[PDB]
Amino acid sequence: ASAAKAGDILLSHSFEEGTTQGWTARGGVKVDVTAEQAYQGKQSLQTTGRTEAWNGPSLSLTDVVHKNEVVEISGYVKLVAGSAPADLKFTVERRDGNGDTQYDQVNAAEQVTDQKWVKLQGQYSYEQGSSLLLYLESTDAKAAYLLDEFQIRLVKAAPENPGEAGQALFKADFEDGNIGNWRARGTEKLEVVSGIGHNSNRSLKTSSRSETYHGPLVEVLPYLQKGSTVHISFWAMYDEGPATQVINGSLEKEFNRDTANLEYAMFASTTLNKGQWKKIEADIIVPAESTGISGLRMYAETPWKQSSEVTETDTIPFYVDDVQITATEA
Ligand SMILES: [Ca+2]
Ligand SMILES: [Ca+2]
Fold this sequence. Notes:
By secondary structure, the protein is mainly beta.
């Protein structure tokens, strides 16, 4: 039940109030606020007395960053006067699932100087861990430096209800409210609705359908091993019209960037009861590289009829949710 949402600020430190705002010494160092220099405002965070590369100012992230969240960590840095140029980076010390120490890289090291403030920035996430310690490090073990306008932003919330270990290659739950790369096939309308979903708040609605082939489509080739065997699954529901309706799950294939000569293949179909969610699934073979395959797109449709024979019941709007592609091998 994640509180924070994408784009939300988790932490912001300007060091303007003469407290280190949670930052402390890692190793035998001196970490304090200074009013001597700053990026913004009057004050910044100073670190001196380093003697080992791993020494630095540190900040506990245990209560800030959660499992599988993607966050963005940033700050401005500058070397203390009289310091030789040196390379700086953010690192996260993490205790893994079995209490072993891991060292996670946040950003790639940047050359920093005593003349000028430099922006450090990177994205971070973790799958398993008990404690998290962010620190600002240099390979120069003697280097002393300032930090200011430090910030942590939430980029992507943790998915919800993350079963069987086949490895999830592709997932769409729509909970972030985002249509992403999903597109219409013709003139129909795609919309991420809230208040309707499969054991969830949101799902992908397709409406204003006027042809049977109209339905939601997404390119999936990039997420997949060419030649592999994978399991495609999604959930569908329709809420109006007849007592029963068939939905199909199909694949649209493109070879050698030839857009004029597509191949189509149905992988599954099921009969749905009005108002009920039902799983549509199958194993499929991703075409081999030798085929010259350049596009592979999954979609949902109602069974094919010619335009002249198309009725109000063929063109029903429907919802799709918990779309998922998993590997068969691990
Ligand atoms: Ca400041
Ligand atoms: Ca959903």
